[model samples]
Target: ELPQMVQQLNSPDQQELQSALRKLSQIASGGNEQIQAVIDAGALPALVQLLSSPNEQILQEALWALSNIASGGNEQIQAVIDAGALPALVQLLSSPNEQILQEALWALSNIASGGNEQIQAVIDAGALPALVQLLSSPNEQILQEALWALSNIASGGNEQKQAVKEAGALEKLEQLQSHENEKIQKEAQEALEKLQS
Candidate 1:
């Protein structure tokens, strides 16, 4: 039987919510079976609900769980998007905590990778400017993830590509074209080439 992560996620006790979020994160990071189990336990809505937690640890763990689920599969991806986590995740783009921002970007990366509808979810949530704003982050992980999200959006259809470009991400991409980190440079290069092509 699956433990009560979902149930505990809604518990009033701060400790219970924190423990539940941690367990859900661990489960989400595992194989497809583990991911599906959490999904089946209704983790999506629960995680989204906790995204409001004042506790950074709870918020961080919830983002990780949602990110892993977003990477799980299309159905799982739809689950998170349907639960309104996309906008909630986008709000975290401005979080003071680097880990929260990093995980939030990772979550957006997978959401954008889930194809048009999922990608559009991020796009419609005013994610373009939010993502564009993160390109200059000193944290390479955040930078790389932002590039990946833009790359995915740039590869999308006209409106999506337009969303990225219109948000002025093209100029930022140019700045990163020769970034010191190869991954950053490569991702920025790919997005730049993609949009320019």
Candidate 2:
């Protein structure tokens, strides 16, 4: 099944690739165990490679795949980090397309889901400042995911907290807590709590 899926993913037909992506998305969404199978079957490199593609659909699908894997565990997060996905994802934060930005934020949020190591990788890859910038995005989804990622990064330890604070995220989060959107306010508050505690 894994081999067949990979072959179909690499097919020349755009529709075939799209079909394989839909299947992969379902398999990845099944939960950590099944997603881990895909990763173990050598999906990481292929997925990471897709990040460089000019196709928006392909990039979105790849981001979805990475997000699913990152949501699984530290092992999966480490796999993405090892495959050098962080820099590519971070580079997308500035994309003019809001959907792409949202997807990138979601993927980063998932990568930072593992706590310290993941956070450090994001920071080390120069993503911290870019993430801080996303706090002010007009798009609610991007702001929420960005704040969630910040909260996770700030949750780990003092080092993470200091790193984020030094990046000027603390003040930005405080400012966001006063936002008109209740959801954004709530997320900002939660991020504040993580940063402070």
- lDDT per model vs. reference: 0.84, 0.84
What global local distance difference test value does model 2 have? 0.84
Which window of ten consecutive residues has the lowest lDDT sum in model 1? 1-10
Error of 2 at 89 (Å): 0.9
lDDT of 1 by residue, 21-58 (tens): 88778878998888899888877877898899888988
Model 2 agreement with the true structure over 49-161: per-residue lDDT tens digits:
88888899988888888888888888878988998899899999888878888888888888877868777888888888899998888877788888888888887778878
Residue 137 lDDT (model 1) = 88
For model 1 the local lDDT of residue 175 reads 86
Model 2: residues with Cα > 4 Å off, grouped in runs: none
Stretches off by above 4 angstroms in model 1 are none
Report residue 76 deviation for candidate 2 (angstroms).
Answer: 1.6
What does candidate 1 score on TM? 0.92
Worst 10 residues of 2 by lDDT: 2-11
